[PDB]
Amino acid sequence: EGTAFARSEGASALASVNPLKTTVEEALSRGWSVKSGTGTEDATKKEVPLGVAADANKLGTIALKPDPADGTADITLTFTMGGAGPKNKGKIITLTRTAADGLWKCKSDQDPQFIPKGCS
């Protein structure tokens, strides 16, 4: 049947993007923007790279939008599960930081029985 396994893939995806929230929050608290890349923060543009490669987790890809993001618009960290097994192939976990409140919400478009703890 494989329900726990499909939830575990969602949890893996979530576990790749969740640590990026702190790096987003810290950058924005300083008035720096956040961008994709795996170098270090660049004071010329005041851009902090997220520090992970798009392909860091072989279940799929990680993407930041907008890129660069300055906190004056909604920010998404997505995990697109292009490398997952049959239940989850093509499914997407999105963390959205809404600019109006500065708070994060998780959503998943997985078939609902496979949505992991800590997303909805």
UniProtKB/Swiss-Prot annotation:
Keywords, ordered alphabetically: Disulfide bond, Fimbrium, Membrane, Methylation, Transmembrane, Transmembrane helix
Gene Ontology CC annotation, any one: type IV pilus
Subcellular location: Fimbrium; Membrane
UniProt key word Flavoprotein: no
Membrane topology: Single-pass membrane protein
The keyword Cytoplasm appears for this protein: no
GO BP annotation list: cell adhesion; type IV pilus-dependent motility
Main location: other
Disulfide bonds: C106-C119
Highest taxon of source: Bacteria
Family: Belongs to the N-Me-Phe pilin family.
Assembly behavior: The pili are polar flexible filaments of about 5.4 nanometers diameter and 2.5 micrometers average length; they consist of only a single polypeptide chain arranged in a helical configuration of five subunits per turn in the assembled pilus.
Protein name: Fimbrial protein
Organism from which the protein derives: Pseudomonas aeruginosa
